[PDB]
Structures are given as C-alpha cells and as structure tokens.
Amino acid sequence: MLKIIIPTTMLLPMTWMSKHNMIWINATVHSLLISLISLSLLNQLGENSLNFSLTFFSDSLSAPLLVLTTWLLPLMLMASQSHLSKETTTRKKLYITMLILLQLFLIMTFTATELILFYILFEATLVPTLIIITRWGNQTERLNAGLYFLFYTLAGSLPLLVALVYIQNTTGSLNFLIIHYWSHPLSNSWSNIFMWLACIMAFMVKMPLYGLHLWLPKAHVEAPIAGSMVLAAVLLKLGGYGMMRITTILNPLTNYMAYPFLMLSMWGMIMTSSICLRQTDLKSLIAYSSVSHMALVIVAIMIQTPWSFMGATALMIAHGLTSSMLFCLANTNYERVHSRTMILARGLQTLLPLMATWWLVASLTNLALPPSINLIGELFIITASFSWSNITIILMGMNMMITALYSLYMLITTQRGKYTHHINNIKPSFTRENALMALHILPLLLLTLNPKMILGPLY
Amino acid sequence: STFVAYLPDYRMQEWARREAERLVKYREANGLPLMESNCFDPNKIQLPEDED
Amino acid sequence: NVLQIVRDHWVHILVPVGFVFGCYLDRRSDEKLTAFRNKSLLFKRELRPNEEVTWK
Amino acid sequence: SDAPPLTLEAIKDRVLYVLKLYDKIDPEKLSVNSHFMKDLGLDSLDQVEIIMAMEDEFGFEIPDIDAEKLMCPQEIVDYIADKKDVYE
Amino acid sequence: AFSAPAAYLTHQQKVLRLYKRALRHLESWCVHRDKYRYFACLMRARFDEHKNEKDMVKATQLLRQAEEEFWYGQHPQPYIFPESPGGTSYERYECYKVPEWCLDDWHPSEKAMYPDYFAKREQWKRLRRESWEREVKQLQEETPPGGPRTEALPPARKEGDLPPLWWHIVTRPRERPM
Amino acid sequence: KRLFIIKPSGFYDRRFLKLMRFYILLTGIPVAIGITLVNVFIGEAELADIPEGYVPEHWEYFKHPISRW
Amino acid sequence: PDSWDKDVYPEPPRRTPAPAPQTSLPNPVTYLTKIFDLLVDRPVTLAREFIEQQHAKNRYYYYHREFRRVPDITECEEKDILCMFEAEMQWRRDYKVDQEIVNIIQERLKACQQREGESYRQNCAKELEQFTQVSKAFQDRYSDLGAHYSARKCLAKQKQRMLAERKAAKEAAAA
Numbered sequence A: 001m002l003k004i005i006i007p008t009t010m011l012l013p014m015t016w017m018s019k020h021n022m023i024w025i026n027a028t029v030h031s032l033l034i035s036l037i038s039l040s041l042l043n044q045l046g047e048n049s050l051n052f053s054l055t056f057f058s059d060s061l062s063a064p065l066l067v068l069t070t071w072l073l074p075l076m077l078m079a080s081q082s083h084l085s086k087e088t089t090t091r092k093k094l095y096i097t098m099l100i101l102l103q104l105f106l107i108m109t110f111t112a113t114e115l116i117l118f119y120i121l122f123e124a125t126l127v128p129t130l131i132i133i134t135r136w137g138n139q140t141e142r143l144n145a146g147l148y149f150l151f152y153t154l155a156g157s158l159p160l161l162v163a164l165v166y167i168q169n170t171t172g173s174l175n176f177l178i179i180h181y182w183s184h185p186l187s188n189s190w191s192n193i194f195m196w197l198a199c200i201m202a203f204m205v206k207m208p209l210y211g212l213h214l215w216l217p218k219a220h221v222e223a224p225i226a227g228s229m230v231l232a233a234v235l236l237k238l239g240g241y242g243m244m245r246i247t248t249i250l251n252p253l254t255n256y257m258a259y260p261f262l263m264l265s266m267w268g269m270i271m272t273s274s275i276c277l278r279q280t281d282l283k284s285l286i287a288y289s290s291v292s293h294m295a296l297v298i299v300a301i302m303i304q305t306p307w308s309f310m311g312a313t314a315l316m317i318a319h320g321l322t323s324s325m326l327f328c329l330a331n332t333n334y335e336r337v338h339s340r341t342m343i344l345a346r347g348l349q350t351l352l353p354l355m356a357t358w359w360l361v362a363s364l365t366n367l368a369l370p371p372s373i374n375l376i377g378e379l380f381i382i383t384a385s386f387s388w389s390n391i392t393i394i395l396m397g398m399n400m401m402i403t404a405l406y407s408l409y410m411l412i413t414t415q416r417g418k419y420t421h422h423i424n425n426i427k428p429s430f431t432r433e434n435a436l437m438a439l440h441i442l443p444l445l446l447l448t449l450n451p452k453m454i455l456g457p458l459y
Numbered sequence B: 001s002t003f004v005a006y007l008p009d010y011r012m013q014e015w016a017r018r019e020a021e022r023l024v025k026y027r028e029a030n031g032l033p034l035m036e037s038n039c040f041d042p043n044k045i046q047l048p049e050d051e052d
Numbered sequence C: 001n002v003l004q005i006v007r008d009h010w011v012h013i014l015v016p017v018g019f020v021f022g023c024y025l026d027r028r029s030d031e032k033l034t035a036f037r038n039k040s041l042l043f044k045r046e047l048r049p050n051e052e053v054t055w056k
Numbered sequence D: 001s002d003a004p005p006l007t008l009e010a011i012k013d014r015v016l017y018v019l020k021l022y023d024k025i026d027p028e029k030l031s032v033n034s035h036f037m038k039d040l041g042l043d044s045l046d047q048v049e050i051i052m053a054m055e056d057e058f059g060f061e062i063p064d065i066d067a068e069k070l071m072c073p074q075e076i077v078d079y080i081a082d083k084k085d086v087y088e
Numbered sequence E: 001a002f003s004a005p006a007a008y009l010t011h012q013q014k015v016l017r018l019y020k021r022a023l024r025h026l027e028s029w030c031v032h033r034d035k036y037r038y039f040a041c042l043m044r045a046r047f048d049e050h051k052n053e054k055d056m057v058k059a060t061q062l063l064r065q066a067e068e069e070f071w072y073g074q075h076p077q078p079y080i081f082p083e084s085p086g087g088t089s090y091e092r093y094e095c096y097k098v099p100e101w102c103l104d105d106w107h108p109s110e111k112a113m114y115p116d117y118f119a120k121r122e123q124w125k126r127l128r129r130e131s132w133e134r135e136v137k138q139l140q141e142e143t144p145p146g147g148p149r150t151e152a153l154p155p156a157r158k159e160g161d162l163p164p165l166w167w168h169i170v171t172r173p174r175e176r177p178m
Numbered sequence F: 001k002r003l004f005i006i007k008p009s010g011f012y013d014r015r016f017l018k019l020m021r022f023y024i025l026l027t028g029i030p031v032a033i034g035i036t037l038v039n040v041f042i043g044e045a046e047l048a049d050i051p052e053g054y055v056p057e058h059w060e061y062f063k064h065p066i067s068r069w
Numbered sequence G: 001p002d003s004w005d006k007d008v009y010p011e012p013p014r015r016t017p018a019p020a021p022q023t024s025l026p027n028p029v030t031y032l033t034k035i036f037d038l039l040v041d042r043p044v045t046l047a048r049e050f051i052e053q054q055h056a057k058n059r060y061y062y063y064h065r066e067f068r069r070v071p072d073i074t075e076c077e078e079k080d081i082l083c084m085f086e087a088e089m090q091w092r093r094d095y096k097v098d099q100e101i102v103n104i105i106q107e108r109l110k111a112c113q114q115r116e117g118e119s120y121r122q123n124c125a126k127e128l129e130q131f132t133q134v135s136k137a138f139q140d141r142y143s144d145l146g147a148h149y150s151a152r153k154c155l156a157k158q159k160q161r162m163l164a165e166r167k168a169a170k171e172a173a174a175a
C-alpha cells in the first residue's frame, strides 16, 4: 500500500519545487500516473481481503473508492486552473497542496485496518476541505457554510470517538479482522441502544441523512468547483463505507434500531426530489439530488442484505462520477455568465452543441438509464427493499418519477428554448472543458462492461 | 481498461464452476442428493442433552 | 546542453522514486510477517530440492 | 424544394388583386397609395375585412395592434415585405 | 408586434377586435366558404344595427353582452394560422436563429472562408460605432425630463443620422434562418 | 440564391473531437493488433491434470496468456 | 462437443425428421442454405483451420487448483483465531461451490423449458423437482444469514433448526 501513499506524498515537494508555469502540467501528469498505479488494486481474492500489513488492507469495497479518489484528483486540477489564473504562484501551490493532502487522507482512510486510525483520518479530511471552502469560495456565505460543515460533522463524530474507545476497552481490540471474527450479538438494553446511536450518527450525518442534511447545500454551493467535486464524489461516501464497516458488530439490534432512519431516508428522498423541482439555483439542485441518492444508499445499508450492499456500492461509485460531471457542467456556465441562476442563460444548445451533448449524457446518467451502473445499483437496492417489504415499491417508483422529472427539467431549462438576447459573452467551449467532461463520462460507460469491479465484497 | 479486462481470475469463479461440475457429477452418478440441508456434519455437533 | 534542462526538470523523478521506494518498503513489510510461511494446514507443502522458501 | 422566394412586385400585385376583387372599391379608382378611409370612403369594418382578406391571401395573421394602421395598399405591402424578410 | 402599445384600448378598438374574433370563430364554425360568407354578412348586418349609437352607456352594455355571447358560443378548437402563437409551427424555427455577435468568435480559419461577407460586416460595425453616440444624444434631447411616457422611438432628423436603437431591429437573424 | 448562414463556431468542438479520437486510436490500435496477434499465434491454454510429484506456479492456474503474464 | 461433460449438461438424443416434399415447387430455404454454406461456412471453417494450425504449434497447459480439507468451524475452540480463519475460508469456498451448483441446476431447467416447446409443463418435471430439492437445501443452508454472514452464523442457524426438529420428533414419539 506504500506504493500508492509514497508517490502521493512526493506530489507535495514536486509541486513546491516546480516553476511558476509548470505546476498544473506536472501535478496533472503525476496524478494521472498515480491513478494508473492505484488501478492495480482491483485484483481481489474473493474469500478474504488483501492484507498488505498490520496497518493497511484492501477490500473489494475499498478498491473502487480508492481508484475513484485517485482519478478524481486530476479532474479537480483540470477544473481548478481556469478560475485560479490570476492567483499568485504561492497561493496556487497552497491550493494544490490542499488537494494533495485531501487525497492522502482519503487514500489512507479507506485502507486502515483499525477503527481509531480510520476515525483520525476521517476527521483529518475536514481541515483541507474547510480551508478550501473558506479561502477560495466566491461568495460571502462561504464562512457560514464552512461553520455548518464543520460543526454538523463534529457533533456526530465525537460520540463515535467515545463509543470506539469504550468498545476497545470492553473487547480488547478495534482491528477490523478481530472485530469481525469475534463478533457477539448486542443485547436489547438502553446502554446498547446508545452505543448503536453513537456508532451510527456520525456516518448518518456524513451521508447526509434527511433532517441532518442542511450543511450540504451550503457547503456544496458555496465551495469552489474542486471543493464541490470532492464533496459530492468522495466525501459523501465516507459515511457509507463507515456504516458497512461498523454494522458488523451492531447485530441484532439494527433489526429495529433502523426503523426511524429508514422512514427518514425514504420520505426525505421523496422530499428532496420534490425540492429539486422548485430550485432557482443550479448547484442547489445537484446538491439535493445528491441528498436523494445518498438517502437511497442509507436505506440499502440499513436493510443489511448482500444485494443491498452490492447496489449501495454501485450507486456510490456512479453517483460520485455523475455528480462531479454535473458540478463541472454547471461551473462552465457559471464561468461564462458569472451567475448561478438557472433561467439567466437559456437555449445554450444553439450556442454550445457539444456541451449540450455532455449535458444530455449527464442528465441521462443522473436518471439512471439502463444499462448504466446507476440503475444497476438503484435496481439492486429496490429489489432488496422489496424483499424487505413489498410496500417500498410505491416510494421507489415515486422517487424514480420525480428524479426523471427534475433531471429533464434542468436539461430543458438550461439547454432548450431560445437564447437570452442581452447575454453576448458566451465563447466557444475550450478543449479543457470538453476533455474534463469526456474524462468524467467515459469511465462511467466503460464500467458497464465490467460491473463486478464496483459491486463490492458481497459479489 | 485492457489491464482490468485481462485481470487474472483470482476471484475463483472458473475454479468454483469446475468444482461444482465435479461435485454434481459425483453426486448424481451415485444417486446422492445434490445438496444437504445441513452445512456441517451432525456427528461433530453436541447439542444440549435435554430440551425440557 | 543538459545542465539547464536537468536543473529545470529534475522534479519529474520524485514520484517514480517514491513509487519504487514504496514497493521496496512493501516488500520489507512483507518480510516481517513470515511466521506462518509453509505452516498453514491448507497450504503446507514439501519444498522443492533447490528452493529455500515458498514465498518471499 | 419549397415555394420560390417572395418578391415585392408579387406582393404588390397580389394585394392589388385582392383589393380589385372587393366590391366596394372601383377597379379603375384603386391605386397602391389610395387611402382606404379618405379616398375610397370606407369605414373601420371594411378595413378589418380587408385585413382578414389579406391574412387569408398570404396565409399568416397580422396582429390587431399593427393592422389598425394599414390604411393604404402600400403600407400592407411594406408590412408583408418586412415580416417575411423580402428585400427585393 | 412592431407598434408601441397605448395605455389603454378605446371602445372603438375593442369593438373592432370583437368583430374580428367573432368573424374568425364563425369561420371556424362555418367550414365552407359560401355558408361562411352568408353568415358573415349576417354578422356584419347585426353588427351595423347599432353602428350610430350615441349613448356610450348602452353601447358599453351592448359590447359586454356581445362579449358574453361570443364567450358562450366560441369555437373550442378555432382555426389558427401555423405561425401564430397557437399554431402548429409557432416557434419551430427558433432553434435555427443564431445571434450575429457569434460571428466575432469564429476562428480565423473559418473567416478565411467568406471574406467579402466579413469585410461588409466590418463596414456595418464601423457604421454602428460611429452612429451610437449621435443616437444617444438624440434620445436624450427628444425625451421629457420625467422619463419617456410611451415605448415610441423617434426617427432620424439630421443628414447622416440613423434612427436611435436600430442595431437589434435591423440585424434580426431571419424568419427562416436556415 | 445562396445566403450566408449565421452559425456558432464549430472549429473548436471539431478540433477537440479530432484530438480525442487521435489519441484514443494512437494508443488503442496497437493494443487491438497485439491482442489479435496473441490470440491467433499464442492461444489459450488447455486443461490438464497435475503430473505426479509436480507443483505448478501460481500463474499456471489461468488459461489466457495475457492474464497469465 | 466433447469440451463440456455431457453428464453435468445432458440433453435428449435430438430426434429430427427427414424431409418429405409434397410439391414440385422448389424449396427456397434449401437453396438459401446452400448459398449460406458455400459463402459463409467454408471461409469461416478455413480461417478456423488456419487458426488451429497456428495454435497447435504452441501448446501449453493450465491446471485446476486443488484445496485440502481443513477442519471446519465446529471443531475450533472459542478464541482460536487461526483455526477460525481457516474454517471461515473453507466455508466461503463451499458457499461459492454451492452457488455454482444451483447455477448449473438452473441452467438445466432453462434449457429444458426452451427445448421442450409446447410440452415443457410435462417434459420438464424432473428438472423442476431437481431444482426444488437443491433450492430447499440451499435455502436451509444459507438463507436469512444476511450481510456480514459467517460460518458461525450458519452453524447457529443449523443448530436452531436441529433443536426444532429434535423437539418435534420427541413430541411426535409421545403420540
């Protein structure tokens, strides 16, 4: 695992020793090389995980997330360099350093064998994101957004720390292998109920769960493009990964402790899909769609079936890629017209046809068109829910209908109709933007040929 | 993508198929059931002696 | 002719050297977990006439 | 292909044709610049009927706010030419 | 579409608009030309029955009753011209209309083709740039201090003057731009 | 008679498409040719019993030559 | 062909009728079949012959990996991590093998349904009962274990079923 971590660390002195006009080129090239190297972790053994050492291990769940992070870094660099052109060399190097530190913390988080190290890195991811949002955000609400993002996370995460140290004291270990092999049932008691809550609420708020999701629109809208990319693509999946790791020791309590969370997730996915229908800001719609998809992931994790975990893993990967692509698409238009209002710029298909094609493909993947992996995950989760209870199909179908509705609503509003007359500064699409959209979309379609790479350990 | 497509079958699916073929052939060649409702041998299980 | 281009492009070796060093450290870490080499009931084997270890 | 491009001469000839097929107008008396209210002694209802006849002739509707001011054949020809982008 | 609207419609304008709407809906009801002509002359006679009324109150009441009759007896599916706001071809060619400022973003290799067109476009741009200041000055001169009262614009009055605010009216893309 | 058609600039999208196709083909045509040559001249292995007293290498439990390599 | 075992994947003797023409009109399907043969099946056969000639010059083998039988989870003491790990690996391997067995039986059922045509309801009863037996066994073995399954949970499920069956048998013995 050091063969991935050490080059990521080497990215720091390499970008701090580069010339003022070569930082983007060097960082992009070596980030792509690191992603290529990290692609070798997909070879999984089946029966058990790849245990490199006492500190790190790789699973069929961790490997797609690691590859997604390593692949997302170069796309973040490509998206960032346009709006940072006027910045000084030192501040651009600091921004790239923030991105590299975030990547390092993420790659170490997904491979830790022990839960305290996972917690330490999972909290350490906060600082670079907070710095990025509050320093390179564009509006004045970035400060309030950063405060929300920090405190919503910490209020859930601190009880997790207390629960983890208590569990290590009572059991003697927190190593995930020992945790799994020496699992014992949780009795029906108030102490066990509060232990369950302390082990669950941090990952709940990172998803986010409906009712604890208010930080996400603020943080995702007010962050720069790279910050939004990493928030939607990767940082939302930390909660799901933590849930999959932690629910091993929570049985059989989850059988009834999951009822309020399932109810909240289903009704709130309906609510957020409905909210997307009346939104004046283009980024907030994407944020709320992310909330709905993560609510579906929460249901999948809560029901505790192999098909549910497979669908949840597929949906996490697909949602990460699709949300990153949608955020980049919105950012291109924002850079054109310097406003996030959806109806300001209309009929962009007449002026930008290839970008309209990218918009159409992203909208089609957002509504989970077959045989894309988005629908693979969603269908697996829906089938698992149907096995859990036949009445879930009503809510699943309603959510599907509303998702198609607002996806095509966004597409029609932004791309169709007639152009706004007074707006006359819409230049032809750059090679960088088209390449960024292609690099987002092509892995999505290529993953359809080999769906088992992202289905997870339960495959 | 080429590297991922040509990844060696470490997941043991072809091996599992061949093992299943061998087991099925052996079991229906002798009239034995294809699968037992008991995963582990009842002879190595020591249940509590009294149930009442 | 190569002095100046080396001085302005030497940064392109840091990441490959880090990769090589990481592989080397991974092998060293593997070297510390040989307690059960050729000792598992499933994979215990008789050594070949010339081989010294089953894996390294 | 579709119909040949329209020309100013054709528009004027068709307008004069429609107006000469109107009974309340003398064919000899009628002229391109002949005012409807003043020279032909017509009223507003006759102008509305003329506008409707022009719409039926050219297969397109003229809004009431614009049709109110078409008081001579030349104005109708100019309106039709400018709407269908006829420049020669 | 081309004329600046007034603050309100007179009784005469409302009367003519009701006449035209009634005639069009009657034509929708009366498909054939001869029957439509017969009933249109009947409508014209009934309409001229109160042509010379002097009491404005009773004329207004007649107009209201006629509007109620039209609404009750209107055609639910009246004939609409294809390019009209309700027609089947209303906004069909809007996707083919590209604004003229997009031609400035063309690559020089694209402008290598069509050289004379772009030279004439340069001529038009110089004309607009040399007329804009005079247009603004004329608009400032011919405007009351309390702002404009209507949406009407004055014509050119000098030797080499162009009517103010003419660029986006003259440079419409087309009605069939492709 | 011929009139000018006002269109947005198509040079840049076409150039991006040519560049992407060029690089993808530059890297993927040699791979396709190599895969075809390997498949034609070095076929897949065929299942055989393990000979007496012989222990195979770990890569000898797979049949495609590329996967074996 | 002989590539796959015909006992694991059996099929009926494939009875086909002989053509018995009743009219002097020429059969277009036969002429089209001859054209297809001469234009497609011969070049493809020649290309395959050349490919096999090239393959014969380079012959190498790959082997099926054999796994020893290690003690299962029933004969591991409560806190012996190594025996537990090896038993769990063996149990997971057996789970995969059982999944593949069920897959083979399902393939047999599907092939029977397609082959028998309009008489599948009568001529596929044996495949149906085979699938019923294997499905019941697989369900009893592995159903309701949920995610995070293990050999210990399978053993607990088996022991619960054994206790229920023993109680039922004992209460029937007194009847």
Ligand SMILES: CCCCCCCCCCCCCCCCC[C@@H](O)O[C@H](CO[C@H](O)CCCCCCCCCCCCCCC)COP(=O)(O)OCC[N+](C)(C)C
Pocket: A188, A189, A190, A193, A210, A211, A212, A257, A260, A261
């Ligand atoms: C906006 C989104 C925020 C996040 C949402 C988090 C959801 C947290 C809710 C937790 C789910 C349930 C908690 C415990 C399960 C049962 C609770 C209780 O009502 O059940 C009965 C418990 O009986 C009584 O109801 C006791 C609880 C009454 C006091 C709790 C106050 C509830 C009022 C609601 C306050 C809002 C809480 C959330 C604040 C934000 C069951 O009867 P009994 O079998 O005998 O007791 C079982 C426990 N034993 C085994 C130890 C004996």
Ligand SMILES: CCCCCCCCCCCCCCCCC[C@@H](O)O[C@H](CO[C@H](O)CCCCCCCCCCCCCCC)COP(=O)(O)OCC[N+](C)(C)C
Pocket: A039, A064, A065, A067, A068, A071, A317, A443, A446, A447, A449, A450, A454, B001, B004, B005, B006, F064
């Ligand atoms: C713009 C112009 C468009 C028009 C031109 C279109 C041209 C034609 C397009 C249509 C092509 C259709 C191709 C259909 C597939 C053919 C090849 C396919 O069969 O191979 C697949 C191979 O797919 C790959 O295995 C999966 C794709 C891997 C994707 C990895 C992307 C690289 C990482 C990038 C970053 C990812 C970030 C997110 C990751 C989580 C499936 O392999 P499989 O049938 O099994 O192999 C059998 C034989 N083997 C096993 C010995 C090989």
Ligand SMILES: CCCCCCCC/C=C\CCCCCCCC(=O)O[C@H](COC(=O)CCCCCCC/C=C/CCCCCCCC)COP(=O)(O)OCCN
Pocket: A151, A152, A153, A154, A155, A156, A159, A162, A163, A166, A190, A191, A192, A194, A195, A197, A198, A199, A201, A202, A205, A212
């Ligand atoms: C940003 C919003 C996120 C909010 C999430 C907050 C919820 C976190 C879950 C509860 C936090 C406290 C959990 C305590 C750590 C668990 C350790 C444990 O299990 O110890 C219990 C101790 O249990 C407790 O003490 C829990 C009491 C609660 C203390 C603080 C209460 C604050 C409010 C609690 C309810 C809210 C929690 C869920 C709300 C989610 C957010 C709305 C039993 O230990 P023993 O004493 O040894 O008993 C056995 C031997 N006799």
Ligand SMILES: CCCCCCCCCCCC(=O)SCCNC(=O)CCNC(=O)[C@H](O)C(C)(C)COP(=O)(O)O
Pocket: D043, D044, D045, E011, E012, E013, E015, E016, E021, E022, E023, E025, E026, E027, E029, E046, E047, E050, E051, E052, E053, E059, E062, E063, E066, E067, E069, E070, E071, E073, E074, E075
């Ligand atoms: C097919 C279904 C449609 C049926 C709906 C019903 C139709 C309506 C039926 C009867 C309508 C009436 O009587 S409506 C009553 C009409 N009476 C008046 O308007 C009195 C004052 N007249 C004037 O102000 C002008 O002379 C003016 C007439 C405007 C002409 O103006 P010009 O000369 O300057 O063009």
